[PDB]
Each structure stands twice: as C-alpha cells, then as structure tokens.
Amino acid sequence: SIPWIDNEFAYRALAHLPKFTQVNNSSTFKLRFRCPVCGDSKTDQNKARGWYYGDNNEGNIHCYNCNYHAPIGIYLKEFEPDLYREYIFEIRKEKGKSRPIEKPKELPKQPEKKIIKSLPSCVRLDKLAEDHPIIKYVKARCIPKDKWKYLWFTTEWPKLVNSIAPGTYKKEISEPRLVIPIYNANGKAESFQGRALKKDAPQKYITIEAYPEATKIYGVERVKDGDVYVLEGPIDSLFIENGIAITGGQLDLEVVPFKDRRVWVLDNEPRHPDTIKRMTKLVDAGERVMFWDKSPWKSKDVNDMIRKEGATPEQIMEYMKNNIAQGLMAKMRLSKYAK
RNA sequence: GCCGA
DNA sequence: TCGGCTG
Ligand SMILES: [Zn+2]
C-alpha cells in the first residue's frame, strides 16, 4: 500500500468533520473525529470514537462506537466519491514511480530546551516535618527515608506546571500532589510527574514534560554498575537498586539505555492480557525479562508486596536476580505464567 | 464500547 | 469532566 497518500487523503477528507484532531506523535499518524456513520454521542463530542490510524502500512479507519473498521479507500467509496476517483487515479499514478517520502528526511527535534532549574510551590520530602500528611502517607507507602530527597510535595500543582509550561490549565486551582522529578543521565531534571495523593486526585494525573524530547525514564542519574532493573512505577523503582522506571503509555525500547543490561521487571498480572502482550513484545525482541511465575507473594507491584504481604527489599532483589530469563526458556516461562 | 485520572 | 485504546 501507499501510506503517505492514505495520510494525506485522510487529512483532506476528515478535516471538515466535527471534533477533528490531528494526533501526530513522532512515529504515529492518527486522526480523531466524530464518526459520521453513527454520530458518536451528543454528550461524548470530545470523546469521539472516530479514529484513523495511518502509522501502519495500510490506513485504517476504526470507530469503536459503531464497530466500523475500514480502510481509507472504502471510506472514500462510501462518502467522498470524487475524492475516491482522484484516489484511484493517484494510486495507479504513483505505482509507476519510486517512493519520494525518504528524500526529505529531516528532524525538527532539539536538545534540553526547558531545563528545570527550580520547583516553585514545592517542598522536598526530606526537608518536610515528620508529622506532615504527605510524610504520613509515604510512611504508609513504606518508602525508605534516605530516598526522601527524591520526592517533593506541592499544593499548587497547576500553578507549578503553568510556571514551567504555561497555558496547560485555564484555572490554577490548588491541588496537593507528589512531585517526582524525572532526571536525565547527566543528572538534571527534564520532566516531573504529579503523582496523585489520597486514594486519587480530582483530575489530570499526568507526567508533565518540559519539552517533547525529554526523558520519560526516572532514576537514570542514579544508575551504578550491575544489572539495571526497569519498573512501571517510579515509587516502585525507588525500592530497587539500579532501578529505573518508564513514565508513559508508550514503551520504546530504543530510548531506554543499557541495552546490554536492562532487566524488565513488570507487574504481576497473569490475567491481564495487555500485560502478557507487553512481556510478549519484550521476549520477541530477545530481551531479558523478569518473571513472576515463582513469586511467593501474589500482590501487584513491589510496593504492594511490601505494604500488603510484609515483604522486605532483600528478598525482592534476590527474586529478581534469581529469575532473569532470556530466549526460548523465557518464552516457555511467559507461556506457563500467562494462564 | 474498555482503561486511566 | 477529559484522552487513548484494533481491527
Ligand atoms: Zn461511529
């Protein structure tokens, strides 16, 4: 197929639809739109199920509301027949020549641009008093005290974010959050994650990037020699020596350093199918994956194993150091672990 | 539609 | 009340 013409004609034929948004991340071309087949919902205008994915070799229009998965050409056949002809002409026109997309291959990225020198309205946890509610809450979270120099507490999290990235929220309503600054390899903060307090925060638990090319891996600056253990939680990574944590829904293996010695230590969730998909895609890369198949504790994450089943960190490090598998042995491990 | 806040 | 989610 011809993906760039799919993206171009999808942008042409979906821009005039209501609630259109050109969601383009650095490898993914997606279009969000109200689906004209079903209309989505009057309440769910912003929650528009009309989705186009052009990052694949074929461009697919999948709407989850009316269950309408279709290529862009079928959409043009049903709705834009002038654009469909033009499409049929242009595809057989461009079949003869070679792809020219590679010719203007440039990058508009940048290095460290919004380097976070200070955190206004934030007090670090080690300089906070021992009877502070955030201090009592992290006492309930059982984080060791010596790492309390890595976490801040705020009450003005929208004001703090708008001090760094203005215009994120129209209202700076005061909100207590746990600031986890995510530093690069050289030790300076490139982002910060606003961890929800109490049972949950009101709204918008989001990692705030200083710039779109900033790191999403917390604790890279604290990596010493030995095997590097990757985790899903920054607080979960705080119980781990040489423990880093990816902060984001996208899991790029290339942006994670230590390719020789990274260890994937994910959640203990066998019933969860996306979890099985994550390890799967990790073992398909031939990577070193840590397996929860012989865990004496049955909680979800390492902090949970500590809080809810009374686990100590030394048992945790010996369990990860005794259960790194790779290759077909790991594949059989995931196999027997999955169900 | 499912999940997260 | 929002975004992101395969077929
Ligand atoms: Zn629809």
Residue numbers in the entry: 3 to 341
Question: Any passages from the paper?
Answer:
The T4 bacteriophage gp41 helicase and gp61 primase assemble into a primosome to couple DNA unwinding with RNA primer synthesis for DNA replication. The domain architecture of the gp41 helicase resembles the bacterial DnaB helicase13,14 with an NTD and a RecA-like CTD that are connected by a linking helix (LH). The gp61 primase is composed of an N-terminal ZBD and a C-terminal RPD that are linked by an 18-residue flexible loop. Here we report a series of cryo-EM structures of T4 primosome assembly intermediates.
Therefore, we utilized an inactive gp41 helicase mutant with an E227Q substitution in the walker-B motif that abolished the ATP-hydrolysis activity, and assembled a T4 primosome with the WT gp61 primase and the ssDNA/RNA primer substrate. We separately refined the helicase and primase regions to improve the resolution. The gp61 primase region achieved ~4.0 Å local resolution where the pentaribonucleotide primer was observed to form a short hybrid duplex with the template DNA that was absent in the WT primosome map. The RNA primer density was just enough to accommodate five ribonucleotides, consistent with the RNA primer provided. The 5-nt RNA primer extends from the gp61 ZBD to the NTL of the gp61 RPD. The primer 5’-triphosphate group is stabilized by Arg51 in the gp61 ZBD loop region; similar to the interaction observed in the T7 gp4 ZBD–ssDNA/RNA primer structure. In the gp61 RPD, the RNA primer binds to the NTL and displaces the ssDNA bound there in the WT primosome structure. The 3’-end of the primer is stabilized by the β-hairpin of the gp61 RPD. Interestingly, the 3′-OH of the primer has passed over the catalytic site in the mutant structure, such that no additional ribonucleotides can be added in this configuration. Indeed, we found that the linker loop stretched and became ordered in the mutant T4 primosome bound to a completed 5-nt RNA primer, as compared to the disordered linker loop in the ssDNA template-bound WT primosome.
